[PDB]
Ligand binder design. Structure first.
Ligand SMILES: Cn1c(Cc2nc(N3CCOCC3)cc(=O)[nH]2)nc2ccccc21
Length: 765
């Protein structure tokens, strides 16, 4: 009744009074409208069925021949566990019907299979092989553990989890040192840094830059307000430190004490708004030809809308109204085309609304893949109340996994003052819709706060004393009441399906490096070996570049699995949580190349003998295949993304044989093919052509599949420019993908070019 308001403030890292203190009507209009939208989404959520509620809380973790395996099935009420044998091609209902007959001695449509000690469920018309939990148990050799949960238990859980030419007067400034004005409609100008007042578009930006050559500060603002009315008159521009930047935020600097301010005046012409859609509908040499053929583009080339929207004159109101008439009648564009329109080059709200309309067909799995890029588009946005915010919030309240990651993508960027207001207001609105999930994320917030204090304890002690004494100091600090309660019994921020319960204090350690990252181990009695999970807590380094690289490798694996090619990739979870704060998922039963190299007689034998120890007898044959597929997959991945600084310490190998990279610090500027890995692929033989030429084929096929989806990597990386990455800021960064994948060249021309690069790495081996 009263605690909710106080709980949001602690959770989002900013007090609710701070929004009210600004006295801005736009912020107040957002808080009132979004709350009603979020509460209506929460009202429909309670009206949903028991299976529909499972689709929200526990989304199906699905995979992107008459095998049989035993399954341990138990009930909610009793501790009785009935183990029986089933088939991999069987439906979950068949497993439920078989479990029903076991309890009869000692209807299945009323049950749902819950994964023991996990926030995951098995349901729907899909064979057992299509589930992520089943396939993971098969390679580990473990038997799946499921619990029968009746419809009444899911329904009871739902009830407990409920809620004239344009001119401006340049007055004065106040800066520190020893003013260029320009009008923009996206990435390009409207006039020279010479435009009529009636010839001004709705999404027009007035950009400023203060300099002496030495750049000092910049400031951008919208000509029209949130209520479609042109701004008048006097305005104070709180400048941001630094030629002219149109991509930057249209909101002033919050530090009104130290940052520079510029006073400007907007001359009154009448209370002139912008004409509504109803009124709009009535009204080198290649660019002119494309605009001439505009009707043929709407009828024959719908995909060419992006090229048509760049050629249209935004500085003339006649061309804008003519284009908008076609846009309202324009057919629905596919996912790939809609992602291109979200870029800063297309600022118009109607273009943005058309993109959202085309993005409505996205599945919860597809939305999760591009979620990071969609959150970045919010930075490019002009106003708080927009279609992208409504779409991201509406889908976050429809799927709890989406709502989990959306929150963390907004919470991690709260320390940045340019996005602190927007991201905080979106999180506040989401909390009004999901009251129970707000409490769930609070437990994660308490755990990360304790981890920061534990990392600070380690950072100080490691300098004062040695490594074994600092480890025991960390152990004694963890054993405390406050630490044992906050760090136990919570949903993992890296994966909401994974439950972190008991923390194994003795297994917990730290790396003796510059930032001192924490190693946190867990265990669950209900889950068993599935509950044995680890988390790496890092503080001081920016993990935004590490996550993006790991998300692209995850995307590569998804695109390869779509064409029936499983290159056994290891896409472990990486997620930033705050100011240089983040988490890394531990890939258990794996070690670095350096640790294994340090019995074997030679360096080439070190990796092979380790595989012979973990996979004995005929199990070694699978480990070589697992290594060959993973090496070929990561070889293309490290070449396309351009991952440099590669040594034995940043390359890891699983006990099953799977090879994977870690520590992605530098990207986008050949691929390493050292004989140490080649020796494993060739089964230990000095000369094995039949085993090497197969590996050569896997590298060539993986490269061609990514070339076909070449535009997808180009569209997503262009949207990530808003984040402000140090290695992904200029047009030269996106050019690396155009050079590595060779988009301009044909399928055969790029494959022949790839063969030269493949032989270059083999000659250096
Ligand atoms: C070796 N070591 C590392 C190195 C390190 N390990 C990483 N992981 C990736 C997931 O499987 C486990 C290893 C990812 C990464 O970026 N850096 N971090 C540590 C943190 C605490 C203790 C030891 C640590």
């Amino acid at each position: 009744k009263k605690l909710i308001n106080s709980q949001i403030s602690l959770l989002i890292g900013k007090g609710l009074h701070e929004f009210d203190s600004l006295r801005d009507p736009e912020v107040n209009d957002f808080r009132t409208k979004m709350r009603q939208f979020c509460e209506e989404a929460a009202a429909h959520r309670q009206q949903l069925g028991w299976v529909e509620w499972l689709q929200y809380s526990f989304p199906l973790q699905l995979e992107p021949s008459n095998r049989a395996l035993l399954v341990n099935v138990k009930f909610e009420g009793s501790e009785e566990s009935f183990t029986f044998q089933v088939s991999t091609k069987d439906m979950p209902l068949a497993l439920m019907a078989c479990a029903l007959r076991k309890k009869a001695t000692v209807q299945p449509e009323e049950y749902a299979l819950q994964v023991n000690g996990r926030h995951e469920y098995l349901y729907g018309n899909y064979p057992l092989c299509h589930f992520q939990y089943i396939c993971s148990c098969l390679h580990s050799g473990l038997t799946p553990h499921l619990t029968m949960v009746h419809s009444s238990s899911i329904l009871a859980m739902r009830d407990e989890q409920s809620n004239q030419p344009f001119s401006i007067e340049l007055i004065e400034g106040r800066k520190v040192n020893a003013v260029q004005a320009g009008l923009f409609h996206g990435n390009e100008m409207l006039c020279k840094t010479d435009i009529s007042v009636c010839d001004l578009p709705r999404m027009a930006r007035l950009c400023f830059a203060l300099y002496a050559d030495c750049p000092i500060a910049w400031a951008n603002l919208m000509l029209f307000d949130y209520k479609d009315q042109l701004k008048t008159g006097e305005r104070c521009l709180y400048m941001w430190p630094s030629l002219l930047n149109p991509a930057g935020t249209v909101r002033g600097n919050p530090n009104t004490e130290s940052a520079a301010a510029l006073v400007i005046y907007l001359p009154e012409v009448a209370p002139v708004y912008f004409p509504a859609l109803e009124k709009i509908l009535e009204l080198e040499h290649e660019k002119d030809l494309v605009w001439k053929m505009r009707h043929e583009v709407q009828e024959h080339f719908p995909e060419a809308l992006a090229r048509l929207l760049l050629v249209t004159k935004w500085n003339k109101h006649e061309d804008v109204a003519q284009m908008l008439y076609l846009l309202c009648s324009w057919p629905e564009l596919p996912v790939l085309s809609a992602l291109e329109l979200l870029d800063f080059s297309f600022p118009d709200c109607y273009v943005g609304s058309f993109a959202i309309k085309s993005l409505r067909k996205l599945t919860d799995d597809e939305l999760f893949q591009y979620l990071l890029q969609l959150v970045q588009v919010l930075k490019y946005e002009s106003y708080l109340d927009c279609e992208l915010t409504k779409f991201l919030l509406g889908r976050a309240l429809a799927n709890r996994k989406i709502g989990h990651f959306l929150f963390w993508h907004l919470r991690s960027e709260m320390h940045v003052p340019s996005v602190a207001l927007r991201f905080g207001l979106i999180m506040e609105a989401y909390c009004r819709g999901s009251t129970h999930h707000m409490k769930v994320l609070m437990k994660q917030g308490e755990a990360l706060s304790k981890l920061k204090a534990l990392n600070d304890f380690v950072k100080v002690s490691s300098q004062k004393t040695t490594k074994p004494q600092t480890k025991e100091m960390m152990h004694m600090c963890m054993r405390q009441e406050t630490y044992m309660e906050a760090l136990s019994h919570l949903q993992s921020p890296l994966d909401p399906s994974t439950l972190l319960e008991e923390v194994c204090v003795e297994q917990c350690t730290f790396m003796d490096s510059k930032m001192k990252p924490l190693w946190i181990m867990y265990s669950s009695e209900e889950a068993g070996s599935a509950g044995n999970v680890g988390i790496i807590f890092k503080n001081g380094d920016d993990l935004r570049q590490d996550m993006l690289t790991l998300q692209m490798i995850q995307l590569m694996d998804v695109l390869w699995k779509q064409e029936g090619l499983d290159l056994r990739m290891t896409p472990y979870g990486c997620l930033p949580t705050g100011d240089r704060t983040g988490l890394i998922e531990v890939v258990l039963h794996s070690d670095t190349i350096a640790n294994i190299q340090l019995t074997a007689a030679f360096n080439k034998d070190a990796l092979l003998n380790w595989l012979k120890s973990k996979n004995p007898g005929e199990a070694l044959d699978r480990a070589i295949e697992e290594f060959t597929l993973s090496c070929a997959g990561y070889c293309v991945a490290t070449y396309v993304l351009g991952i440099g600084d590669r040594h034995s310490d940043n390359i890891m190998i699983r006990e099953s044989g799977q090879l994977f990279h870690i520590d992605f610090g530098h990207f986008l500027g050949p691929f390493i093919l050292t004989y140490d890995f080649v020796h494993v692929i060739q089964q230990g033989k000095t000369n094995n052509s039949e085993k090497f030429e197969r590996f050569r084929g896997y590298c060539e096929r993986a490269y061609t599949i990514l070339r076909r989806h070449g535009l997808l990597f180009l569209h997503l990386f262009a949207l990530m420019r808003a984040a402000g990455l140090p290695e992904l800021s200029c047009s030269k960064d996106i050019q690396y993908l155009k050079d590595s994948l060779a988009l301009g060249k044909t399928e055969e021309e790029a494959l022949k070019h790839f063969r030269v690069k493949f032989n270059e790495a083999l000659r250096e081996s």
